[PDB]
Design a protein around this ligand. Structure first.
Ligand SMILES: [Mg+2]
Lengths: 575, 576
């Protein structure tokens, strides 16, 4: 941000009321889904009352599959003492403090998170109007940075707390501001580099930075009388350097355990994960995931980091060695190298969970771009839930561009993304956290050719504690209750992603809900019928059970161990 | 900080070693004074060992009056397993974690505060290494920004946590970086202005900003369609605007409860109170004290609107009290009054919080009179903290004033005491009135090196009348308190003698300017000279005996190491 006026230009009364209307609509919809509130009918209108009962929220809505509340945002009115009141998200959460589990200690910081979400919405409303169809054809990073919703379940989901407004405008992914990494040299008595198969440190940094920059960086070390052979390069988010490391790790800088090397040349864009950077100067080079000590202090831990490339190499060999997965086109983009720093004094003074141990670390992830064949393009799977200012579905614009039948388009999408989740569960007892942000879709002519998974090591799990795995990999084992294993599919895919996709394709008039879930059931049976030898597992974990548990995402957020209250009708049980 | 190399240029191995040695010297000295550690004499050296015994710190020292440990910084050595090790402040506190009461939870944040303290010392070591005599001749703000010690008792004292390094380099007092304030218009439904006697809001802001700036700001409100009469002006620290208010109070900006007016034109310097600004473009104008949500020991500071409605009236009362007392008027004592205050009330955070939440201390400001227009010919201004200042070569700023004055040291001291100390004694005995009388909230007026008179500041939040039944105005009755009788006099013995005179006596004794016994003999004489001038308070002099043999050792570092009295000290006025 340059001037004082520009710093708050996005905050206008009009944009604010629109942002408050959209957030309250989502709060009402997802709080009702999670049975934290229970709207009552009154005529052709639903009503939700505050704790005290003196304030009423009235709206029109239709309940859809999986208890999805489809609320008209323009129908929402707020009433008290027979007087209509403006919509105000902050008042809304205060008035339902007790209905939501908001402790006295969490409510103020929750409101701050809401103010930041509302502010980001205000900023996004200042961005040029772009339609769904124009967004489909706009490019990988135009799609990444053109997302407005964020996670579709969490009400407080786009909080950039810890960023001043100038830093929000420089670093938030929706601003599409170019970012340059700061590079430190870390002494090898305190830093360690871990690489996957085929990676050599000296050639790795040469490929990433180019030899001219590497030699310039060496000159900084030698000008101080230091030997480059004793040091490792660590890339650092500028916010982390200026606001944290330069002060908190001052002792490491002064003693030359860390040396500030300079800025890197290449321009990067923050992704939806704000600490993960895509290289736009060189899209073929690695993503860089950085440590970022902002609170929800968060960061990136150096502990679990030593095995991360090996877990990625393991899973890649697993997909290649399996014709069922290779036939879906499933690939991952591997975490390929990692570097971690050990602040020995903070280590002595802290336990393993302290944010002082997550302040300096990075990892590198393969770019999906060199895998692209002719006419293929990249889109975050999150984009399938995007809706433009006119109410058009991004997924709809893809179906129209494909000229395919909607159910046929959907079947190809499910073959590429959904089928491999089933095989991983039944063949290998293997699950992910397969939400929108950690899946990249490959599109040709509007059609999903294949899927790419990312964010592997921190997310994958084998639900067999006595399964044969390499030593570096064994740590991804766990014992999961038999009743809960299958929620990996119902919660994370059905209730947290398809629920929204099916409602949006129906609302647009593209595909009825029944056909959507029919198609889902067809594809599940197709995979089932193709693997008879796994039938013992299909019976013990039935995808077609009539009900499964309702896992509530906002409830977990309002606590600071899953939050299961009640059950949902399984959409595929009668197909 | 523009450049990436400029962001850490102050951090060099040599300055860091120097800063670690100095901080360890102070920690050993003040921890031993508070009896947190007990050095053992091992021949001609003292020894302090880590909690486990594996590490030893060896140093020569002399124990001076009031159990002051004068340690030679260059004699400190660290030893483990028959090897001599480099001094490392962070290791020092981890090794003594249990002796010091550092719990598991606050130890990490304590070490971060120490790092900040150490970084600031490194920064200060890159400043021109100016001499005590030169600094004495340097003018009011050169002295203010040239202080290096900070509080003389607290080991972790100059932490600027919450600032990035670029922010430290723009805003910390020791950088002497000009700062322009940001001005907000706050709607009168959520903001309130409070004035002292003779203050009118419209003339007040016209004086401070000038008509041109004031019309430019009214313009900003008109283009938005707003009525300036519905708004109050609030100046804000730029760090506070960019890092806190524009994000946390976004609802107030959007709904136009707050409106960003722009940047004031006058250049300010941060004082040793980093949230308080002196106007360099017009030194006659008021100090501006702003809300600043930085961190102190994990806790978010700021400026609250709670006791804000009565801060001017408290200052008006104290000023009138001084003007009306012949004893105080004879010492020349004055105050620079907090004259006007303004507060904002974020109603939504109010519903969500209790009285003590940092969300209520985020937007408020007050104005303090400048001492500059009081100055007569040859008069200059110096923070009283500068009496403890020692330059790079070890020369005392006070000794430099003594040398410039041409007076015998005891006589120079006697005039300083009559100027600053006599009013404290009189305040306590005549009115049961005490202050927070430390170096940063007293300003000295100097003429030809001599202390002509003293000026107090930081009044409302610090003053206390130890009498529940004392006659006071309604808005001023809040400063009353009932504290135990054996505690009342500690406000002199602790805050004056043990936290300030202890250091000044040792500094003048180290320079060969004044022996410790002659220092305290002079304090005693000034004490008796005051008592002999007020025989009608004689019974009080004996109820609260300034000449008692001992007083309680109050331990300032003990408090800070707990986020919240052990033994006694011989009162330096024995047979004196
Ligand atoms: Mg900042």
């Amino acid at each position: 941000h340059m001037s004082l006026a520009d710093s708050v230009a996005h905050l206008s009364p009009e944009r604010w009321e629109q942002a408050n209307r959209l957030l309250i609509r989502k709060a009402l919809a997802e709080f009702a889904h999670e049975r934290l509130i229970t709207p009552e009918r009154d005529g052709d209108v639903y009503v939700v009352r505050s704790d005290d009962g003196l304030t009423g929220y009235r709206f029109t809505a239709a309940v859809r599959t999986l208890d999805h509340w489809q609320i008209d945002a323009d129908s929402i009115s707020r009433h008290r003492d027979g007087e209509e009141l403006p919509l105000a998200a902050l008042d809304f959460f205060i008035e339902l403090k007790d209905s939501l589990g908001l402790s006295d200690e969490i409510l103020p910081v929750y409101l701050e998170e809401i103010s930041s979400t509302l502010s980001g919405t205000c900023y996004k409303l200042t961005k040029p109007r772009i339609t769904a169809a124009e967004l489909a054809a706009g490019g990988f990073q135009a799609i990444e940075t053109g997302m407005t919703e964020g996670h579709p379940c969490f009400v407080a989901n786009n909080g950039r707390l810890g960023f001043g407004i100038h830093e929000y405008l420089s670093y938030a992914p929706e601003t599409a501001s170019p970012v340059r990494l700061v590079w430190l040299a870390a002494h090898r008595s305190r830093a360690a580099f871990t690489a996957g198969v085929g990676i050599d440190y000296e050639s790795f940094v040469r490929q990433e930075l180019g030899e001219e920059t590497v030699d310039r960086f060496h000159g900084v070390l030698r000008e101080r009388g230091l030997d480059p052979a004793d040091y490792l390069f660590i890339p650092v988010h500028p916010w982390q350097w200026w606001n944290k490391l330069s002060v908190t790790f001052a002792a490491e800088v002064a003693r030359q355990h860390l040396v500030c090397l300079g800025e890197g040349d290449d321009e990067y864009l923050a992704q939806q994960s704000i600490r993960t950077f895509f290289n736009t100067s060189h899209p073929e080079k690695h993503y860089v995931k950085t440590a970022l000590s902002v609170i929800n202090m968060r960061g990136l831990s150096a502990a679990y980091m030593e095995a991360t490339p090996a877990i990625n190499d393991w899973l890649a060999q697993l997909i290649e060695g399996d014709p069922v997965l290779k036939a879906t086109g499933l690939t991952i983009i591997r975490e390929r190298a990692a570097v971690g720093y050990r602040h020995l004094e903070y280590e002595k003074a802290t336990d393993r969970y302290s944010p002082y141990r997550k302040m300096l670390a990075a990892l590198w992830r393969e770019s999906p771009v060199p895998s692209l064949r002719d006419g293929e393009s990249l889109a975050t799977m999150a984009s399938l839930l995007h809706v433009d200012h006119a109410g058009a579905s991004f997924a709809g614009a893809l179906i129209a561009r494909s000229g395919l039948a909607p159910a046929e388009w959907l079947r190809r999408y499910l073959r590429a993304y959904y089928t491999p989740l089933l095989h991983s569960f039944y063949a290998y007892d293997l699950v992910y956290m397969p939400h929108g942000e950690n899946v990249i879709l490959v599109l040709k002519d509007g059609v999903v050719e294949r899927a790419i998974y990312k964010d592997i090591a921190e997310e994958i799990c084998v639900m067999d504690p006595d399964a044969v795995l390499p030593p570096e990999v064994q740590r991804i084992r766990a014992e999961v209750p038999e009743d809960t294993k299958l929620l990996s599919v119902f919660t994370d895919v059905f209730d947290c992603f398809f629920r929204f996709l099916a409602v949006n394709l129906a609302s647009e008039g593209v595909l009825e809900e029944d056909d959507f879930w029919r198609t889902v059931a067809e594809v599940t049976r197709e995979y089932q019928e193709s693997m008879p030898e796994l039938a013992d597992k299909f019976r013990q974990y039935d995808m077609f059970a009539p009900e499964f548990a309702l896992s509530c995402l906002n409830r977990l957020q309002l606590r600071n161990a899953l939050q299961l209250v009640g059950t949902l009708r399984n959409p595929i049980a009668g197909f």
